[PDB]
């Protein structure tokens, strides 16, 4: 399965002009388009090689869409001030994510159309693509409004139609790169500590897509040892990195195994020091 997702942010800056409005689009973990209202001559712009050959009509249509959305989000930010009885002097953020998860046979697995205000859930289209989940009393105003307007119908039509159709085209355009499942290359490093014990660190490098699970285990028992798991991070070349550590007694290193699961692996990896 694959995903097409757009991430939209407006941030007000009272006293410094109109809000900054931005969009970024992704296929799976690969960015491919951007918009930034603060750029000189703002236009929708390519950020992956396999989108650069969409014709001029594509960029004109997406730029027009972004500039209409920008006006919408200006209105939304002003309305949020009224809903929350907030002063006109503060900076606030409105975020929006929309997109589709699609199986390789074209089946829509899940559609998303959801918002956050000042970094917290505001309103979200439910998995049925028919009803809304509102996070507070302000969002209940929006829910009533969009229910009476039938807003979800148009949203669902995008998620079941346009989103699915264009994801298919993008995967065709970028089939030389987007379909890969590069498995992690893994190893364990060993670091004696001054305290007399040992840090074992299990590394996973060079993998795509970004989803991965790294786990330290013994022989089924729950590990009470001190552990640490860093956030998955981009290498910058289209692959990702992660590590996971455990502090173990000196002389007991061989009791611990690191287990690695990833879409690109035919079998999960098990590694020891």
């Amino acid at each position: 399965s694959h995903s097409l997702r757009y991430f939209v942010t407006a941030v007000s800056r009272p006293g410094f002009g109109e809000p900054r409005y931005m969009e970024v689009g992704y296929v799976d973990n690969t960015e491919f388009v951007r918009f930034d209202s603060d750029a000189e001559n703002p236009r929708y712009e390519p950020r992956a090689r396999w989108i650069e050959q969409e014709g001029p009509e594509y960029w004109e249509r997406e730029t027009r869409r972004a500039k209409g959305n920008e006006q919408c989000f200006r209105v939304d930010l002003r309305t949020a001030l009224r809903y929350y009885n907030q002063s006109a002097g503060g900076s606030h953020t409105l975020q929006w994510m929309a997109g589709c998860d699609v199986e390789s046979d074209g089946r829509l697995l899940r559609g998303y159309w959801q918002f956050a205000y000042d970094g917290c859930d505001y309103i979200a289209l439910n998995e049925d693509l028919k009803t809304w989940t509102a996070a507070d009393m302000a969002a209940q105003i929006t829910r009533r409004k969009w229910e009476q307007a039938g807003a979800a119908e148009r949203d669902r039509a995008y998620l079941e139609g346009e989103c699915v159709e264009w994801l298919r085209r993008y995967l065709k355009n970028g089939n030389a790169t987007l379909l890969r499942t590069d498995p992690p290359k893994a190893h364990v490093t060993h670091h004696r500590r001054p305290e007399g014990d040992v840090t074992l660190r299990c590394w996973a490098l060079g993998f795509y897509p970004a989803d991965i699970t790294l786990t330290w285990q013994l022989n089924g028992e729950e590990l009470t040892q001190e552990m640490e798991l860093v956030e998955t991070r981009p290498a910058g070349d289209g692959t990702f990195q992660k590590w996971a550590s455990v502090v173990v007694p000196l002389g007991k290193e061989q009791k611990y195994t690191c287990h690695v699961e990833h879409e690109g692996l035919p079998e999960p990896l098990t590694l020891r020091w």
Binding site: Y6, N69, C72, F73, W96, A98, A151, W166
Partner: peptide, 10 residues
């Protein structure tokens, strides 16, 4: 292609 607000506001 991306989603359009279609001037549906909160």
């Amino acid at each position: 292609r991306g989603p359009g607000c279609a001037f549906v506001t909160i």
